[PDB]
A paper describes a structure:
MpPA14 (Marinomonas primoryensis PA14 domain) lectin is a domain of a 1.5-MDa adhesin responsible for a symbiotic bacterium-diatom interaction in Antarctica. Bioinformatic analyses indicated the presence of an ∼20-kDa domain near the C terminus of MpIBP that is a member of the PA14 family, which is a carbohydrate-binding lectin module widely distributed across several kingdoms of life. PA14 domains share a β-sandwich fold and the presence of two consecutive aspartate residues in a cis peptide linkage (DcisD). The DcisD motif coordinates a Ca2+ ion that is directly involved in binding polar vicinal hydroxyl groups of various carbohydrates.
Galactose has its C-4 hydroxyl in the axial position instead of being equatorial as in glucose. Docking of the galactopyranose ring to MpPA14 via the 3,4-diol is not possible due to steric hinderance against Gln129 and Ser130 on L-9. Instead, galactose can only interact with MpPA14 via the 1,2-diol of its rare β-anomer. These limitations explain the relatively weak interaction between galactose and MpPA14. Having just shown the 3,4-diol of galactopyranose cannot complex MpPA14, binding of GalNAc is completely abolished because its 1,2-diol is unavailable due to the C-2 hydroxyl being substituted with an acetyl group. Similarly, since the MpPA14 binds galactose via the 1,2-diol (β-anomer), the lectin cannot interact with galactans, as they are polymers of β-1,4-d-galactose.
Numbering used by the authors: 7 to 190
The structure:
């Protein structure tokens, strides 16, 4: 547009809290669409939690975000339910990949507009090995994530494999870009 966006080795993060129930992806997306973010942050190391007693309460969000919490724009007030919306880019070579995500509650990850990892409901801590997807051309791929907590425990760690599920890595500053330019 007319405003420069910060270039960092991470995704652009937004946190939203609510006192309504989050049951599914559409509920969290409606929350995101309903207001300005309760806080913004840089999501440079996307391995959050685990903790207890509601992500949206007290300092639980800070604890959940860990290393990334130092970039919070503000300390949100309490809510019962809450979640994050992350957007930016991830450097991937052409090839085949799959996510394996540990989470409480649900989430959705999309790459180049296509969902590649989805849990459309609340759940206690579970790890799902998602189906494989292909990247046609090497470079920075567009990626967005949503995750939420309806209450209770909370964790979010979406790991990626490039080698058919033999090894997995966290998405972090090695490969993330907020704008699709290279972070130095
Ligand atoms: O489905 C029930 C589960 O819901 C999760 O949101 C919560 O973190 C768990 O502790 C358990 O209550
Ligand atoms: Ca801009
Ligand atoms: Ca919004
Ligand atoms: Ca707080
Ligand atoms: Ca941590
Ligand atoms: Ca930090
Ligand atoms: Ca709730
Ligand atoms: Ca929960």
């Amino acid at each position: 547009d007319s405003t420069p966006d910060s270039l960092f080795a991470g995704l652009v993060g937004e946190y939203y809290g609510t006192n309504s129930q989050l049951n599914n992806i559409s509920d969290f997306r409606a929350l995101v669409d309903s207001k300005e973010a309760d806080a913004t942050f840089e999501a440079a190391n996307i391995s959050y939690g685990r903790g207890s007693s509601d992500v949206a309460k007290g300092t639980h969000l800070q604890e959940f975000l860990g290393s990334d919490a130092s970039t919070l724009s503000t300390d949100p007030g309490d809510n019962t339910d809450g979640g994050i919306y992350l957007q930016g880019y991830v450097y991937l070579e052409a090839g085949t990949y799959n996510f394996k995500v540990t989470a409480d509650d649900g989430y959705e990850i999309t790459i180049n507009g296509n969902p590649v990892a989805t849990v459309d409901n609340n759940q206690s801590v579970y790890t799902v090995t998602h189906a494989s997807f292909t990247i046609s051309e090497s470079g920075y791929q567009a990626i967005d994530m949503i995750w939420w907590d309806q209450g209770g425990d909370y964790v979010f760690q979406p790991t990626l494999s490039a080698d058919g599920g033999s090894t997995y890595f966290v998405l972090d500053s090695a490969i993330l870009s907020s704008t699709g330019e290279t972070p130095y």
